[PDB]
């Protein structure tokens, strides 16, 4: 009804596209409700190009104390622009939220696509998953070359565009640590998208990213993560136990190469986990799985997976689809909060 009206405004924006302040971008329906604020599609009023506007609400920022995570995402995306990391176009604030306005990935996200392909389709076909995984690896490699440990990687942070090339995003879950100080205790990332090292509050390096990669591929094929089945929605403590102990059942839906790749990563120990051996980023590349991948074509973003999003097919949630998280109960901002908000803006 009204949700269809919101869908109609989205269709209108797409049509225009095919052919600051947030007042300089016409705003459409949300594409998800982040941890902080709305994340809606939007279109430049003066350019006629579509951008996503990840809004991080000031209230919600104060509640979780998510100031560090925001600043990280800004600086990283601002510096790193490729065909596997989304370009950042603007970083401003309003009076209600901080904005990162980034280049479109109109084709929806991999997480959506698990369920959008068809619910009676048990995840992606093996070649299609392999292609996306390879593209994620090149993106991880680029981060590692700048000495960035990303920690939490997950399907919803791997976005599809309409060219059938994927890019990572949400780089606020990262920490930048140069080689020779990568190791250091810490807990970071969202549970069930974390590696053993992180949960135990132990030293970590690039290894954790390869664990996440494994989780991602497993989820692409089986339509479920390793740490939850489809009847599991268990609390954090049990989820932590799954990550730490389990090497799950590996479907025969997998190719032998893909099966083997999953087996290696979801087996505990970084030394026995592909990639990290001496800390290689090309340790992944030796697996028979990548016999179907050419490195030159990978680096140029020319890999074509089965199913490529159309520009006359809409990918996005309805505008009123929200998650809802703490906003003020009579609570007024500190000076410090305001100072972070101005500092972020540029």
């Amino acid at each position: 009804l009204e949700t269809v009206v919101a869908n109609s405004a989205f269709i209108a924006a797409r049509g225009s596209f095919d052919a600051m302040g947030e007042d300089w971008f016409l705003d459409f329906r949300v594409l998800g409700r982040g941890g902080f604020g709305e994340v809606f599609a939007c279109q430049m009023k003066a350019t006629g190009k579509l951008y996503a506007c990840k809004k991080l609400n000031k209230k919600r920022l104060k509640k979780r104390k998510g100031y560090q995570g925001a600043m990280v995402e800004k600086k990283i995306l601002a510096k790193v622009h490729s065909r596997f990391i989304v370009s950042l176009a603007y970083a401003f604030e309003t009076k209600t939220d901080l904005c990162l306005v980034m280049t479109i990935m109109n084709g929806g996200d991999i997480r959506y696509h698990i369920y959008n392909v068809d619910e009676d389709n048990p995840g992606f076909q093996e070649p299609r998953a392999i292609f996306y995984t390879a593209q994620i690896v090149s993106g991880l490699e680029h981060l590692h070359q700048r000495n960035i440990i990303y920690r939490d990687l997950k399907p919803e942070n791997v976005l599809l565009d309409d060219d059938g090339n994927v890019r990572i995003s949400d780089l606020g879950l990262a920490v930048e640590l140069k080689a020779g100080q990568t190791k250091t205790k810490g807990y970071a990332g969202t549970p069930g998208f974390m590696a053993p090292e992180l949960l135990l509050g132990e030293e970590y390096d690039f290894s954790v990213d390869y664990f996440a990669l494994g989780v991602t591929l497993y989820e692409m094929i089986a339509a479920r993560g390793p740490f939850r089945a489809r009847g599991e929605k268990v609390e954090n403590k049990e989820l932590k136990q799954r990550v730490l102990e389990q090497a799950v059942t590996y479907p025969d839906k997998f190719s032998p190469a893909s099966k083997d790749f999953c087996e290696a990563l979801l087996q505990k120990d970084p030394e026995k986990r592909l990639g990290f051996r001496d800390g290689s980023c090309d340790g992944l590349r030796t697996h028979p799985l990548f016999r179907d991948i050419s490195w030159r074509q990978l680096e140029a973003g020319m890999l074509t997976p089965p199913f490529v999003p159309d520009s006359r097919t809409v990918y996005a949630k309805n505008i009123q689809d929200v998650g809802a998280f703490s906003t003020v109960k009579g609570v007024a901002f500190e000076k410090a909060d305001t100072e972070f908000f101005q500092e972020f803006a540029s």
């Binding site: 009804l1 009204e2 919101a6 109609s8 209108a12 007042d23 009023k45």
Partner: protein, 324 residues
């Protein structure tokens, strides 16, 4: 003119019973009956019973989900408050008075009661106008440098109050007067005469143009545009059966929305206009209670149309009603 003129009253029933003087304190039985009062009281009871839960829900649902507490919902909260002004200003008073068979709060009471009822209905009126504007601006995209952000939202809300006060405040300063309407157990606006001594004529013209005709034009414009847009959009995105059905349904809804504005304010406008264009009428006094019934019911139907048929609110409401 066909009623009874007085220097502080205008009974829309002819003087011939000799008790048509001062309907403020005169028992009304020379233009009404006890059974009609029971029906009046029944109707007012209904309007409270439906209106109060409906408006409470609008406020309530936003509080249970954090994300609903956002600028674009402000106008909806305003609508619910406006409606509650109609409940406590209009409905409750009229229910009390009707059972005595006349208005018992006196001339001063009449000015108060009439003010709160008018104020209520006018904030409601202008909410509906602003809502149509906002929908037109956001979806059809005709204007630049407008958004429904926090500052804009607040301005929008404030505007409905200002326009409402601009109508409700004049009869208190002798630019018009509040005097019993209907069965004379509710107080309405004097518009039955162009009585210069209280300055009725200019006020009636002002009301008809600014508070009916202007709204009517805006409502037709906005909603016409909206239907155009939604039809066009559906044509440009034919691949979902749901979306095509929805487009037809939305168009139907929009007709209902326009009609709902008409029902509420057209009776008052119609009656007022007719007496002005041609002196005298064959309108009764029970006839004048008919416009009030239609107007008052908008406290029920406006949130039903504009709240209930949106997905998020539905889910939340269902959850709470089915244990929550």
């Amino acid at each position: 003119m066909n009623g009874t003129e007085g220097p502080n009253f205008y009974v829309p029933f002819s003087n011939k019973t000799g008790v048509v003087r001062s309907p403020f304190e005169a028992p009304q039985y020379y233009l009404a009956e006890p059974w009609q009062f029971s029906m009046l009281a029944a109707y007012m009871f209904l309007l409270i019973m439906l209106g109060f839960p409906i408006n409470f829900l609008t406020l309530y649902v936003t509080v249970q989900h954090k994300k609903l507490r956002t600028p674009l919902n402000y106008i909806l909260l305003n609508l619910a408050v406006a409606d509650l002004f109609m409940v406590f200003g209009g409905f409750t008073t009229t229910l009390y008075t009707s059972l005595h068979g006349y208005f018992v709060f006196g001339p001063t009471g009449c000015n108060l009661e009439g003010f709160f009822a008018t104020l209520g209905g006018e904030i409601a009126l202008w909410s509906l106008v602003v809502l149509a504007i906002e929908r037109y601006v956001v979806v059809c995209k005709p204007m630049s440098n407008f958004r429904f952000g926090e500052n804009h939202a607040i301005m929008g809300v404030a505007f409905t109050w200002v326009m409402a006060l601009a109508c409700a405040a004049p009869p208190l300063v002798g630019w018009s007067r509040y005097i019993p309407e209907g069965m004379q157990c509710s107080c309405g606006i004097d518009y039955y005469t162009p009585h210069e001594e209280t300055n009725n004529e200019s006020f009636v013209i002002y009301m008809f143009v600014v508070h009916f005709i202007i709204p009517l034009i805006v409502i037709f414009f906005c909603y016409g545009q909206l239907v155009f847009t939604v039809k066009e959009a559906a044509a440009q995105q034919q691949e979902s059966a749901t979306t095509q059905k929805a487009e037809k349904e939305v168009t139907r809804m929009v007709i209902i929305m326009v009609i709902a504005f008409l029902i509420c304010w057209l009776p008052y406008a119609g009656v007022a206009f007719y007496i002005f264009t041609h002196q005298g009428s064959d309108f009764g006094p029970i006839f004048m209670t008919i416009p009030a019934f239609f107007a008052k019911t908008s406290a029920v139907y406006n949130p039903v149309i504009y709240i209930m048929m949106n997905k998020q609110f539905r889910n939340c409401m269902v959850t709470t009603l089915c244990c929550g």
